[PDB]
């Protein structure tokens, strides 16, 4: 476990061809792999190979080790960016394996993953609501004059932009300034009499209803479902000594 953690700490600096420091650290990553290979060899030579295979964690370890060996072989031949990114990813995937080693860590990881799995339908419902609001936002505000917080990034000019800004608003950050930007009326804009796509300012009451409804619904109600799910799963799995 300690060796795993050290190898994970080897990623403290960005691996980069230009940076000379990258060359030593890459070499430093090689030896660890070999050591890790021994860890596999031991475990596969103490038990029958089938016995080693029986434990899923052993399977994961063997997969990671084989990937690392492939990376080692490539690194000495190509020596390009691809090798360095592959090695960094191998090290990340190995570091993530520490969860199985510890007990409480494993329990909490199981809790989190199970909560994610059991929340699928709720998340789908949130997505469907967000998509409806995205379409309505593109219709109402897709041509709003740029303002305090509508800009290149926060924009309703296409469904993807609308979805991203709505997800932001689910995180809450400055939703009200976007709302007030969408309120913009004359003389701050040039209105159009025939088409809504030829003008550059949005709808007052539409903005109020849209943003207030979306915020109340998503942020005050729906997330508490996921909170409850986390609570339930934590109770289910996490269990220390019991009197």
């Amino acid at each position: 476990a300690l060796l795993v953690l050290a190898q994970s700490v080897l990623l403290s600096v960005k691996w980069d061809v230009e940076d000379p420091v990258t060359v030593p650290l890459a070499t430093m990553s090689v030896v660890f792999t070999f050591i890790f290979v021994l860890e596999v060899t031991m475990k596969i030579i103490a038990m029958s190979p089938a016995g080693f295979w029986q434990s899923r964690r052993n399977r994961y370890d063997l997969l990671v080790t084989s990937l690392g060996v492939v990376w080692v072989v490539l690194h000495f031949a190509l020596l390009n960016a691809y090798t360095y990114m592959m090695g960094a990813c191998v090290i990340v995937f190995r570091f993530f394996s520490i969860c199985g080693k510890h007990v409480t860590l494993k329990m909490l990881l199981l809790t989190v993953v199970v909560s994610m799995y059991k929340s699928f339908f709720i998340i789908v419902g949130m997505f469907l609501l967000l998509l409806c609001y995205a379409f309505a936002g593109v219709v109402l505000f897709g041509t709003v004059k740029y303002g305090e917080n509508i800009n290149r990034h926060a924009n309703f000019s296409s469904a993807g932009k609308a979805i991203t800004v709505l997800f932001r608003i689910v995180t809450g950050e400055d939703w009200n300034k976007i709302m007030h930007d969408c309120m913009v009326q004359p003389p701050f804009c040039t209105p159009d009499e025939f088409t809504y796509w030829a003008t550059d300012c949005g709808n007052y009451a539409g903005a109020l209803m849209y943003f207030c409804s979306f915020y109340v619904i998503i942020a005050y109600i729906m997330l508490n479902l996921l909170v409850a799910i986390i609570v339930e799963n934590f109770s289910l799995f996490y269990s220390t000594e019991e009197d």
Binding site: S12, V13, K14, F95, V112, T171, L226, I230, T240
Partner: protein, 288 residues
């Protein structure tokens, strides 16, 4: 000490003492010089009373002894600084840092448990163990996303600067409005338009303090930024800097997953822990 009236007096004195230490501040006396003598007076008077207590206890108390020692030190420092031999803006005021804790004494009566304290201790032990476990969980995820940020997101110090900007001449007038990050790549990131060019401000000689602490230059600052983002305070602006500076998909995957995992679920684990603590209170005492 015998009369309950003494204990009531000592508790109101504790409240007066915390008020006094809240009042003692250089700009307070700069605004209301007379309070300088008020602060001193209360500071001495209360100390006398507590001295009596220390004298009368010879026939947990270490806390009260430390507190009366701190009152002594504070009174000495106040005598020194009213003499004007030590600058009122000097750091020595830090000697008063532990005096506010006197507030605890005001509630000490409620802190007293006569029932089987063992049960309370067990509850607190369970809660501490759980909190430590979840703390290790959170720290592991923070380190993971730290190293991920260091590898993917480089350093956010390239900016669009006016075409003819020169080193050392960097100034407000050299930046675009609003200040936009950039990438030297021809295909990735934002492309500075005509009359502007992308370059690293840090090379021009700005300090890290002047550039700001946030960023993914090293594991420490990476995990610092990750914790900041996981607080949901300023994450979208960091995402925008990353989108302008690097391939968009990296920023989207990183920040969306960070917000999904850390900012909702992991925080909710502490809510679950505290709910279980209350469930244990229900099981053990059934009377809270």
């Amino acid at each position: 000490i015998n009369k309950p009236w003494v204990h009531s007096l000592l508790r109101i004195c504790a409240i007066i003492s915390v008020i006094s230490v809240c009042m003692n501040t250089p700009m307070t006396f700069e605004h209301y010089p007379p309070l300088q003598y008020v602060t001193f007076t209360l500071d001495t008077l209360l100390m006398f009373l507590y001295t009596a207590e220390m004298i009368a206890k010879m026939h947990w108390c270490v806390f009260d002894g430390f507190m009366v020692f701190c009152l002594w030190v504070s009174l000495v420092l106040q005598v020194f600084e009213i003499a004007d031999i030590v600058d009122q803006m000097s750091p020595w005021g830090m000697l008063r840092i532990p005096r506010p804790l006197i507030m605890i004494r005001a509630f000490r009566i409620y802190f007293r448990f006569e029932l089987p304290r063992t049960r309370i201790t067990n509850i607190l032990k369970r809660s501490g163990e759980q909190i430590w476990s979840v703390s290790i969980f959170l720290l592991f995820f923070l380190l993971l996303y730290g190293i991920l940020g260091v590898q993917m997101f480089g350093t956010f110090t390239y900016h669009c600067v006016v075409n003819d900007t020169k080193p050392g001449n960097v100034t407000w007038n050299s930046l675009a409005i609003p200040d936009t990050h950039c990438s030297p790549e021809l295909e990735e990131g934002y492309q500075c338009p005509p009359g502007f060019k992308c370059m690293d401000l840090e090379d021009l000689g700005l300090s890290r303090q002047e550039l700001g602490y946030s960023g993914f230059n090293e594991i420490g600052t990476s995990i610092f930024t990750v914790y900041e983002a996981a607080s949901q305070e300023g994450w979208v602006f960091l995402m925008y800097r990353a989108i302008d500076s690097f391939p968009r998909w990296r920023s989207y995957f990183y920040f969306i997953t960070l917000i999904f995992f850390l900012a909702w679920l992991v925080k909710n684990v502490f809510i679950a822990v505290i709910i279980e603590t209350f469930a244990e209170i229900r099981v053990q005492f059934q009377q809270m």
